[PDB]
Structure 1
Amino acid sequence: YKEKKREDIYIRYLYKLRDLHRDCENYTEAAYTLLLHAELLQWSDKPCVPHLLQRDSYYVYTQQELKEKLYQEIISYFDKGKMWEKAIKLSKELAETYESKVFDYEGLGNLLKKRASFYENIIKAMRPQPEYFAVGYYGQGFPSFLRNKIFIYRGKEYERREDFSLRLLTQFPNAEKMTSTTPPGEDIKSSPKQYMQCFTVKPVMSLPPSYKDKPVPEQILNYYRANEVQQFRYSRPFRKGEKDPDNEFATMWIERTTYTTAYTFPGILKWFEVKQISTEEISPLENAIETMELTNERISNCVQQHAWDRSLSVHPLSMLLSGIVDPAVMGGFSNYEKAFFTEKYLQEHPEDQEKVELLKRLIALQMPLLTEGIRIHGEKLTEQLKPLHERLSSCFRELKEKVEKHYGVITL
């Protein structure tokens, strides 16, 4: 109907949808529907049309009255939806419309103090991250719009892929757990007895411009790592050929898989056909290099968010340091010398060389990050954390010499 721009039955079904979601007790999507209804309406003081009204209640109704009513229940939903950024935004425009258009200062105050309450909830409340499972459809007998398509679902907040399998497959007798996640089935593309495949995929973050260079707490980072996303990665490994069991990191290729969808979660509906696919894979060299790079990003963010809170979360950060030392000193770097600091790592390819000096400068950056963590732990030490600190600092020193003389990593 949207395509055929018949706004009226459009609205009719939009309200059918809000009722349907209510009976489903889903609130974010119900709010989203309510918005896309509302965004038809404008801030003109002219009650231009009664046709846009549902036939429930009408008096004179300048459009702004209806818009603000809509916003009242919409912000109510976003509240009970326990998702807030869009709510506080809608509060921004509702507040400005009040203040410079109708001057109903009691409402100004009510909504703005509620916006403040929402701010504190943002900080104080926990946000579980729903996981995103990719659901292909293959088989003859589906509804036509459910055939040979990938629907990735924002599942429940504490719900794991197997439980989603329960939902879909108890939802579908003729259940099939067709395990080859990657390929469709040409036979099944018109064979009945429908093939499913399901697997978690990982969201591409909603990088908000101008927020990278700020004292952003973890709150903003999680809120945008789990919501208003469009792309979702999924990685699988490759290992064939040069079969050294010591460190296979010359043929440990991995095959990430990302997708692009037409619109953005969360939406009026909690799934979507896939509208574009990112088929990809990389040689293990660049792969592990990016693993190290993202690890440096990890602890960099850790120290920056930590560079302003004294009684911040202590023990898990110390545990990140422990993982830096206990498993990674021997194993996580044995590859650094064998798989990398050997001549074979160049006879793989004369094409590029910034590889190994790049990882060397990365570890060169890495160590001062650990100095930072070491001293801030020196503030964070507990009765048992001094000996752990001293032993990890002994390892830290020996790694100083390993990077500087053993690795040959340039000091700077």
Structure 2
Amino acid sequence: GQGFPSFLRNKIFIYRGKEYERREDFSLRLLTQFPNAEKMTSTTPPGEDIKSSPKQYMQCFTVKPVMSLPPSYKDKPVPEQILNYYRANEVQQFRYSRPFRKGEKDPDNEFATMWIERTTYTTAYTFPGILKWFEVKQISTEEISPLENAIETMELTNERISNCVQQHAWDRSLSVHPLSMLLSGIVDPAVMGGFSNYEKAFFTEKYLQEHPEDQEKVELLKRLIALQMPLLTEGIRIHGEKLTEQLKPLHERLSSCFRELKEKVEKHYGVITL
């Protein structure tokens, strides 16, 4: 907009919100701060007219606090607490994901089009600071192939499963419900099968014609799921440690489908487990 004061007009800021402020809670709280409380909808790109137009325009959206590097920590088995502190505090980089359709809109499949224009944000000063907010200092975008999309989704999946594994491997009086959460969601991609989606999209020779030279990534995905599988094994056994009679039908289904996918990766996927 232009009604903004000089230092505010056409400026992008990042706000260290509260512990659990929803995007719209903070949005409304800012609406309190301002008259002409309106939001455009073109959330990602700017608005050229409103770069010069009056009638101050605003937009809010959570960004991803890009993980910092705790120096000298890069490999030691340091417990999570240190990192979860570093997870959000002492940060300067901020990425923002961007959906996009790039490919044919095949009905059963969304990943034939999935390309992500993650927008990275680098501010001047590292949160937390003397001010609960700061302008962006440099902004940049990204581009993510469905190959990559699968790669990093698979990754974060793996480390999340790890995370639950050790947190319940360290604490005993701990809810089994998250184990149910995870083991369910991973075991049956019931609403839609992500694994078969990988197979139809990438493992298919058709992808090897669309991206012949870019087959060096489907092998990466195979390695990813291969490394997953023993983690699934420890998840299964952790459940067995936390198994209850209610979970027993649950556990048997989990275990049965677990060795099902075991053999699927070993031979049906033909990927080599370690």
User: Do both proteins adopt the same fold according to a TM-score greater than 0.5, normalized to the shorter chain?
Assistant: yes
Where 1:261 maps in the other structure, the secondary structure is strand
How far did 1:383 drift?
A: 3.0
How far did 1:398 drift?
A: 1.2
Question: For residues 227-273 of structure 1, what are the alpha-carbon distances to aligned partners after superposition, in whole Å with 9 as ceiling and x for unaligned?
Answer: 11111121121114312122232321112112000111110001101
Gaps of 5+ in 2: none
Where 1:236 maps in the other structure, the secondary structure is coil
Question: For residues 205-245 of structure 1, what are the alpha-carbon distances to aligned partners after superposition, in whole Å with 9 as ceiling and x for unaligned?
Answer: 22313445455444333322221111112112111431212
How far did 1:279 drift?
A: 0.9
Is 1:289–1:359's contact at 8 Å kept on the other side of the alignment? yes
State the distance in 1 between where 2:50 and 2:44 align: 14
Where 1:252 maps in the other structure, the secondary structure is coil
Gaps of 5+ in 1: 1-138
Equivalent residues in 2 for 1:101-140, closer than 5 Å: 139-140=1-2
State the distance in 1 between where 2:97 and 2:185 align: 23
Is 2:147–2:218's contact at 8 Å kept on the other side of the alignment? no
State the distance in 2 between where 1:329 and 1:337 align: 17
Deviates more, 1:320-329 or 1:301-310: 301-310
The TM-score with structure 1 as length reference comes to 0.62
Question: For residues 260-307 of structure 1, what are the alpha-carbon distances to aligned partners after superposition, in whole Å with 9 as ceiling and x for unaligned?
Answer: 001111100011011011211211121112111221122223334444
How far did 1:349 drift?
A: 1.8
Is 1:242–1:248's contact at 8 Å kept on the other side of the alignment? no
Are residues 1:251 and 2:86 paired? no
State the distance in 1 between where 2:240 and 2:74 align: 28
Is 1:254–1:283's contact at 8 Å kept on the other side of the alignment? yes
Q: Which has the higher contact order (CA 8 A, sep 6+)?
A: 2
Question: For residues 118-176 of structure 1, what are the alpha-carbon distances to aligned partners after superposition, in whole Å with 9 as ceiling and x for unaligned?
Answer: xxxxxxxxxxxxxxxxxxxxx11221111211011112223222122222223222222
State the distance in 2 between where 1:337 and 1:189 align: 45
Where 2:86 maps in the other structure, the secondary structure is helix
Are residues 1:272 and 2:142 paired? no
State the distance in 2 between where 1:330 and 1:336 align: 12
Are residues 1:310 and 2:168 paired? no
In the superposition, relative to structure 1, how do residues 240 and 206 fare at CA in structure 2: closer, same or farther (>3 Å)? closer
In the superposition, relative to structure 1, how do residues 199 and 333 fare at CA in structure 2: closer, same or farther (>3 Å)? same
In the superposition, relative to structure 1, how do residues 187 and 407 fare at CA in structure 2: closer, same or farther (>3 Å)? same
State the distance in 2 between where 1:305 and 1:210 align: 23
Where 1:215 maps in the other structure, the secondary structure is coil
Max Rg structure: 1
Question: For residues 341-395 of structure 1, what are the alpha-carbon distances to aligned partners after superposition, in whole Å with 9 as ceiling and x for unaligned?
Answer: 2112112223322211111121111111111121222222223223211111011
Where 1:165 maps in the other structure, the secondary structure is helix
State the distance in 1 between where 2:166 and 2:80 align: 10
How far did 1:328 drift?
A: 6.2
- Aligned CA-pair RMSD: 2.1
Where 2:239 maps in the other structure, the secondary structure is helix
